[PDB]
Design an enzyme around this catalytic site. Structure first.
Site, PDB file in Angstrom:
ATOM      1  N   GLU A 163       0.858  -1.181   0.000  1.00 16.58           N
ATOM      2  CA  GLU A 163       0.000   0.000   0.000  1.00 16.58           C
ATOM      3  C   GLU A 163       0.894   1.232   0.000  1.00 16.58           C
ATOM      4  OE1 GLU A 163      -0.247   2.495   2.468  1.00 16.58           O
ATOM      5  OE2 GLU A 163      -2.204   3.439   2.125  1.00 16.58           O
ATOM      6  N   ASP A 210      -7.847   1.443   8.119  1.00 18.08           N
ATOM      7  CA  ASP A 210      -6.475   1.944   8.019  1.00 18.08           C
ATOM      8  C   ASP A 210      -6.263   2.970   9.142  1.00 18.08           C
ATOM      9  OD1 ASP A 210      -3.918   2.538   7.077  1.00 18.08           O
ATOM     10  OD2 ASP A 210      -4.516   3.148   5.051  1.00 18.08           O
TER      11      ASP A 210
END
Ligand code: 1BN
Ligand code: ZN
EC number: 2.3.2.5
Length: 323
Positions: A163, A210
């Site tokens: 990511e 997240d």
């Protein structure tokens, strides 16, 4: 020409009553998650590192020991990076692979690359070792209920690799795992044998966790097409609060407040959102003060907040799946 891909638009939750809410609250263990799911991930695990391999083995092993019928897949691929071609591996864990629809929970399991600075190493505790552990604890805490899935709808977990940017975020240096997997899912017929629907049409909702784990998180209601699900999270938090099932929690300091965010926050949901998948982005705004700092570590995590969010998320998933 089936309208099944539109089912997600009318899908309603089967709301848990007080007794069930108490059961879910008592059924998750923040101390067990801490020791068994989180601590093994609090290591350097940038793409291609020995730590990435250990993190992937840990996630797979923790899922494999469960009773529910999880099907694990390692999605390995190459991508150009600022450091040349490199290999990445997404982890996908799916219940009922052939079910047409899946509710999808996801986070990234890589940690951002930083050369060791003054004997400190970046472990990305909120980013996103905690989200990883919350997904593993959810799979464990709801295992008996999930075992019963063995409404053509089930559950899928995705742990994205890559990511983070290897350098500083830029469009070609970031979201390696998600850009790859969204493209792959968009081009894969689903269910098997389908003429014109893809695995993305089967994604009811992508709930992406997240930067979770710091004190006092405030999550914005980012998108109109998932607003009704954000409202369910608000309702769940409110009821769990009223029933005295949350710890060190007040409504004034609630996590899901009435407020949107009109800006764009780049993360793993982007390649899915731009292909039409509804997203519930559980990332706080502002970000944890320790964001991208060596202080994003275990000591700075807020235990009760994570425990409270585990309860809220688990109720959300059971209500979504009618379990
Ligand atoms: C700027 C650009 C991209 C992001 C995405 N992000 C999320 C977790 N770590 C980084 C955040 C700020
Ligand atoms: Zn980050």
């Amino acid at each position: 020409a089936s309208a099944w891909p539109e089912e997600k638009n009318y899908h309603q939750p089967a709301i848990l009553n007080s007794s069930a809410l108490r059961q879910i609250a008592e059924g998750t263990s923040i101390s067990e998650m801490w020791q068994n799911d989180l601590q093994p991930l609090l290591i350097e695990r940038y793409p291609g590192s020995p730590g990435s391999y250990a993190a992937r083995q840990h996630i797979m092993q923790r899922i494999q020991r469960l009773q529910a019928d999880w099907v694990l897949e390692i999605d390995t691929f190459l991508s150009q990076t600022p450091y040349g071609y490199r290999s990445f591996s997404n982890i996908i864990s799916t219940l009922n692979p052939t079910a047409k629809r899946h509710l999808v929970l996801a986070c990234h399991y890589d940690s951002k690359y930083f050369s060791h600075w003054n004997n400190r190493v970046f472990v990305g505790a909120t980013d996103s070792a905690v989200p990883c552990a919350m997904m593993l604890e959810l799979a464990r805490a709801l295992d008996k209920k999930l075992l019963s899935l063995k409404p053509d709808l089930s559950l899928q977990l995705i742990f994205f690799d890559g990511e983070e940017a290897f350098l500083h975020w830029s469009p070609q240096d970031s979201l390696y795992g998600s850009r790859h997997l969204a493209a792959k899912m968009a081009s894969t017929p689903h269910p098997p044998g389908a003429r014109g629907t893809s695995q993305l049409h089967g994604m009811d909702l992508l709930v992406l966790l997240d930067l979770i784990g710091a004190p006092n998180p405030t999550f914005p209601n980012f998108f109109p097409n998932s607003a009704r699900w954000f409202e369910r999270l608000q309702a769940i938090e409110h009821e769990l609060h009223e029933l005295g099932l949350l710890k060190d929690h007040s409504l004034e300091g609630r996590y899901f407040q009435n407020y949107s965010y009109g800006g764009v926050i780049q993360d793993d949901h982007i390649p899915f959102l731009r292909r039409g998948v509804p997203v519930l982005h559980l990332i706080p705004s502002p970000f944890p003060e320790v964001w991208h700092t060596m202080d994003d570590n275990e000591e700075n995590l807020d235990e009760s907040t994570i425990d409270n969010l585990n309860k809220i998320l688990q109720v959300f998933v059971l209500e979504y799946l009618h379990l």
